[PDB]
Amino acid sequence: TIQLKQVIDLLAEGELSNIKYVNIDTGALVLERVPSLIRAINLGVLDLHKRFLLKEGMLKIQLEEGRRLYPLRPAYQVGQKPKPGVPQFITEGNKLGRQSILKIEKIIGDNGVEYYLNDTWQPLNITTPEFDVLEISDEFYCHSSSKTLEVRYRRAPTPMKICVDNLDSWGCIDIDLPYTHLQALLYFVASRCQTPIGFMENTAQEGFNFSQKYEAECANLDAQNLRIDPVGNQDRFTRGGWV
Amino acid sequence: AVEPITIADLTEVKLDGKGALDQLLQVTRLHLAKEHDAGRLKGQEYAAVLTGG
């Protein structure tokens, strides 16, 4: 799910050719605003991961009786930096970053049971008070019979860190996307960069046009169904009674 | 003391010549180039202004 940054910039030359970002007026060659371009591209990738799933992750929480709030932050995760004031209880899963948890979706115990999320008055309900924290009531401990939990959530990749010495290559960086959403990302970046420039009648609408094309492309990807889509088929016949 | 002003004096055909027309066009190009280098001109107003001028 990777692409060389080199290819991306070479292609974005073909749509940013009007403006400062990539061209000297004479002998149009890429400038050194590459930092700003990278900062825009990362935002574009995050937006695409918002619009389509494209990824999902997993954790594993080791419970501790009498605890009320379990935050999911990269200071509690094994292999991260062990801040002394916190006990590292997240013992397994994808390395956690600042933007990794877009939404928690499933909670599965060690017994194979499936608990309920934000479904009030359900038998064993788990509540998220702050979108990245699990609040576990005492009734859960009363009737849990589970020493650990498995969490699944919608992910977004962690962008690679650029550096002033890394300005040498900038071409070994790898964006994390399938190529389809590359074609879409091009329009996103072009719109964002071209918006605040131009004073002529036809040159003041390029940002708007690129936004329109971006939306059209997203709709086309949805129609072609090039993203993950689970579909549920319960049993309903093993409960005992529907047969 | 009679130097005859000629078409060469006005402008020689080369782009980088020393004719008055050539150097005026060059300075206009430089100003527009700096304007485009700053985030203020697209690559089409650059042509429009020159052709008008």
mmCIF file of N, CA, C and O in Angstrom, chain B residues 6-45:
data_model
loop_
_atom_site.group_PDB
_atom_site.id
_atom_site.type_symbol
_atom_site.label_atom_id
_atom_site.label_comp_id
_atom_site.label_asym_id
_atom_site.label_seq_id
_atom_site.Cartn_x
_atom_site.Cartn_y
_atom_site.Cartn_z
ATOM 1 N N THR B 6 19.969 53.489 -36.066
ATOM 2 C CA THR B 6 19.485 52.516 -37.027
ATOM 3 C C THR B 6 18.542 51.539 -36.346
ATOM 4 O O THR B 6 18.311 51.588 -35.131
ATOM 5 N N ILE B 7 18.014 50.626 -37.157
ATOM 6 C CA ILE B 7 17.155 49.576 -36.632
ATOM 7 C C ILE B 7 17.920 48.726 -35.632
ATOM 8 O O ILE B 7 17.355 48.237 -34.651
ATOM 9 N N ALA B 8 19.213 48.521 -35.872
ATOM 10 C CA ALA B 8 20.033 47.809 -34.900
ATOM 11 C C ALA B 8 20.078 48.555 -33.577
ATOM 12 O O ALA B 8 20.040 47.940 -32.503
ATOM 13 N N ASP B 9 20.173 49.882 -33.636
ATOM 14 C CA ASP B 9 20.146 50.677 -32.417
ATOM 15 C C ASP B 9 18.821 50.511 -31.692
ATOM 16 O O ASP B 9 18.791 50.399 -30.463
ATOM 17 N N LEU B 10 17.710 50.510 -32.431
ATOM 18 C CA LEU B 10 16.416 50.309 -31.781
ATOM 19 C C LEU B 10 16.325 48.927 -31.157
ATOM 20 O O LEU B 10 16.056 48.789 -29.961
ATOM 21 N N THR B 11 16.565 47.891 -31.952
ATOM 22 C CA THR B 11 16.561 46.521 -31.473
ATOM 23 C C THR B 11 17.218 45.585 -32.478
ATOM 24 O O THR B 11 16.860 45.568 -33.659
ATOM 25 N N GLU B 12 18.209 44.828 -32.030
ATOM 26 C CA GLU B 12 18.660 43.692 -32.809
ATOM 27 C C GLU B 12 17.751 42.502 -32.530
ATOM 28 O O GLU B 12 17.052 42.444 -31.516
ATOM 29 N N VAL B 13 17.737 41.557 -33.468
ATOM 30 C CA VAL B 13 16.664 40.572 -33.477
ATOM 31 C C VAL B 13 16.781 39.600 -32.305
ATOM 32 O O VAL B 13 15.783 39.004 -31.889
ATOM 33 N N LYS B 14 17.972 39.438 -31.738
ATOM 34 C CA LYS B 14 18.157 38.461 -30.672
ATOM 35 C C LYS B 14 17.325 38.813 -29.445
ATOM 36 O O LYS B 14 17.022 39.979 -29.183
ATOM 37 N N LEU B 15 16.950 37.778 -28.690
ATOM 38 C CA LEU B 15 16.184 37.991 -27.466
ATOM 39 C C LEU B 15 16.998 38.739 -26.422
ATOM 40 O O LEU B 15 16.477 39.632 -25.747
ATOM 41 N N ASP B 16 18.275 38.395 -26.277
ATOM 42 C CA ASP B 16 19.136 38.968 -25.255
ATOM 43 C C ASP B 16 19.920 40.173 -25.752
ATOM 44 O O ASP B 16 20.976 40.483 -25.193
ATOM 45 N N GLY B 17 19.450 40.837 -26.797
ATOM 46 C CA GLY B 17 20.182 41.942 -27.368
ATOM 47 C C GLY B 17 20.240 43.142 -26.440
ATOM 48 O O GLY B 17 19.804 43.117 -25.290
ATOM 49 N N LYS B 18 20.800 44.226 -26.971
ATOM 50 C CA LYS B 18 20.949 45.469 -26.227
ATOM 51 C C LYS B 18 20.056 46.579 -26.755
ATOM 52 O O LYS B 18 20.220 47.734 -26.355
ATOM 53 N N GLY B 19 19.127 46.263 -27.647
ATOM 54 C CA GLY B 19 18.198 47.267 -28.111
ATOM 55 C C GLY B 19 17.295 47.760 -27.000
ATOM 56 O O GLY B 19 17.063 47.086 -25.995
ATOM 57 N N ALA B 20 16.787 48.978 -27.187
ATOM 58 C CA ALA B 20 15.937 49.576 -26.166
ATOM 59 C C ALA B 20 14.686 48.743 -25.939
ATOM 60 O O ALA B 20 14.302 48.483 -24.790
ATOM 61 N N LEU B 21 14.045 48.310 -27.021
ATOM 62 C CA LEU B 21 12.882 47.443 -26.895
ATOM 63 C C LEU B 21 13.238 46.170 -26.148
ATOM 64 O O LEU B 21 12.496 45.726 -25.261
ATOM 65 N N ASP B 22 14.384 45.582 -26.482
ATOM 66 C CA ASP B 22 14.788 44.338 -25.848
ATOM 67 C C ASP B 22 14.963 44.517 -24.351
ATOM 68 O O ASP B 22 14.493 43.694 -23.560
ATOM 69 N N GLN B 23 15.614 45.599 -23.934
ATOM 70 C CA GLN B 23 15.890 45.740 -22.512
ATOM 71 C C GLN B 23 14.638 46.128 -21.738
ATOM 72 O O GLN B 23 14.460 45.706 -20.588
ATOM 73 N N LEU B 24 13.745 46.908 -22.347
ATOM 74 C CA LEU B 24 12.477 47.180 -21.681
ATOM 75 C C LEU B 24 11.679 45.900 -21.487
ATOM 76 O O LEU B 24 11.115 45.659 -20.410
ATOM 77 N N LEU B 25 11.637 45.051 -22.511
ATOM 78 C CA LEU B 25 10.945 43.781 -22.353
ATOM 79 C C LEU B 25 11.613 42.926 -21.287
ATOM 80 O O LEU B 25 10.932 42.242 -20.516
ATOM 81 N N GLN B 26 12.943 42.960 -21.215
ATOM 82 C CA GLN B 26 13.638 42.173 -20.204
ATOM 83 C C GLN B 26 13.290 42.634 -18.796
ATOM 84 O O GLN B 26 13.080 41.807 -17.902
ATOM 85 N N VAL B 27 13.234 43.945 -18.568
ATOM 86 C CA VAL B 27 12.924 44.407 -17.219
ATOM 87 C C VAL B 27 11.478 44.081 -16.866
ATOM 88 O O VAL B 27 11.169 43.715 -15.720
ATOM 89 N N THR B 28 10.571 44.181 -17.840
ATOM 90 C CA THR B 28 9.200 43.760 -17.579
ATOM 91 C C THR B 28 9.151 42.284 -17.213
ATOM 92 O O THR B 28 8.447 41.885 -16.274
ATOM 93 N N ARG B 29 9.910 41.461 -17.935
ATOM 94 C CA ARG B 29 9.956 40.041 -17.626
ATOM 95 C C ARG B 29 10.476 39.801 -16.222
ATOM 96 O O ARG B 29 9.974 38.927 -15.517
ATOM 97 N N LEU B 30 11.494 40.549 -15.800
ATOM 98 C CA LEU B 30 12.034 40.336 -14.460
ATOM 99 C C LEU B 30 11.012 40.676 -13.391
ATOM 100 O O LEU B 30 10.859 39.945 -12.403
ATOM 101 N N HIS B 31 10.308 41.792 -13.559
ATOM 102 C CA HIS B 31 9.305 42.150 -12.564
ATOM 103 C C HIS B 31 8.211 41.095 -12.493
ATOM 104 O O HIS B 31 7.824 40.650 -11.404
ATOM 105 N N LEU B 32 7.725 40.652 -13.652
ATOM 106 C CA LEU B 32 6.698 39.619 -13.649
ATOM 107 C C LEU B 32 7.222 38.318 -13.059
ATOM 108 O O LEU B 32 6.485 37.595 -12.383
ATOM 109 N N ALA B 33 8.486 37.995 -13.310
ATOM 110 C CA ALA B 33 9.042 36.758 -12.785
ATOM 111 C C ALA B 33 9.102 36.788 -11.272
ATOM 112 O O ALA B 33 8.754 35.806 -10.617
ATOM 113 N N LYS B 34 9.540 37.903 -10.694
ATOM 114 C CA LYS B 34 9.525 37.984 -9.240
ATOM 115 C C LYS B 34 8.102 37.899 -8.708
ATOM 116 O O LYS B 34 7.849 37.252 -7.681
ATOM 117 N N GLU B 35 7.153 38.539 -9.395
ATOM 118 C CA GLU B 35 5.771 38.465 -8.933
ATOM 119 C C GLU B 35 5.266 37.030 -8.928
ATOM 120 O O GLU B 35 4.578 36.609 -7.994
ATOM 121 N N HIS B 36 5.590 36.269 -9.967
ATOM 122 C CA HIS B 36 5.159 34.875 -10.022
ATOM 123 C C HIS B 36 5.881 34.025 -8.992
ATOM 124 O O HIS B 36 5.310 33.067 -8.460
ATOM 125 N N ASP B 37 7.150 34.325 -8.734
ATOM 126 C CA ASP B 37 7.889 33.568 -7.735
ATOM 127 C C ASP B 37 7.265 33.735 -6.363
ATOM 128 O O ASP B 37 7.122 32.767 -5.608
ATOM 129 N N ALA B 38 6.897 34.959 -6.015
ATOM 130 C CA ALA B 38 6.003 35.100 -4.882
ATOM 131 C C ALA B 38 4.633 34.556 -5.265
ATOM 132 O O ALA B 38 4.260 34.513 -6.436
ATOM 133 N N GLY B 39 3.878 34.123 -4.269
ATOM 134 C CA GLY B 39 2.606 33.506 -4.582
ATOM 135 C C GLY B 39 1.554 34.501 -5.017
ATOM 136 O O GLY B 39 0.577 34.716 -4.299
ATOM 137 N N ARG B 40 1.732 35.123 -6.182
ATOM 138 C CA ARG B 40 0.787 36.152 -6.597
ATOM 139 C C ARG B 40 0.362 36.097 -8.055
ATOM 140 O O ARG B 40 -0.607 36.773 -8.402
ATOM 141 N N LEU B 41 1.032 35.343 -8.920
ATOM 142 C CA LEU B 41 0.628 35.250 -10.317
ATOM 143 C C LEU B 41 0.596 33.803 -10.764
ATOM 144 O O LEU B 41 1.491 33.027 -10.426
ATOM 145 N N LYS B 42 -0.423 33.450 -11.535
ATOM 146 C CA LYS B 42 -0.394 32.189 -12.245
ATOM 147 C C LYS B 42 0.372 32.354 -13.549
ATOM 148 O O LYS B 42 0.706 33.460 -13.970
ATOM 149 N N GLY B 43 0.635 31.237 -14.204
ATOM 150 C CA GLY B 43 1.426 31.286 -15.410
ATOM 151 C C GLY B 43 0.722 31.818 -16.631
ATOM 152 O O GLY B 43 1.320 31.849 -17.707
ATOM 153 N N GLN B 44 -0.532 32.237 -16.509
ATOM 154 C CA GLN B 44 -1.296 32.735 -17.644
ATOM 155 C C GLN B 44 -1.453 34.244 -17.651
ATOM 156 O O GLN B 44 -1.378 34.861 -18.718
ATOM 157 N N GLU B 45 -1.670 34.862 -16.490
ATOM 158 C CA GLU B 45 -1.619 36.316 -16.440
ATOM 159 C C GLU B 45 -0.255 36.820 -16.875
ATOM 160 O O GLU B 45 -0.147 37.908 -17.450
#
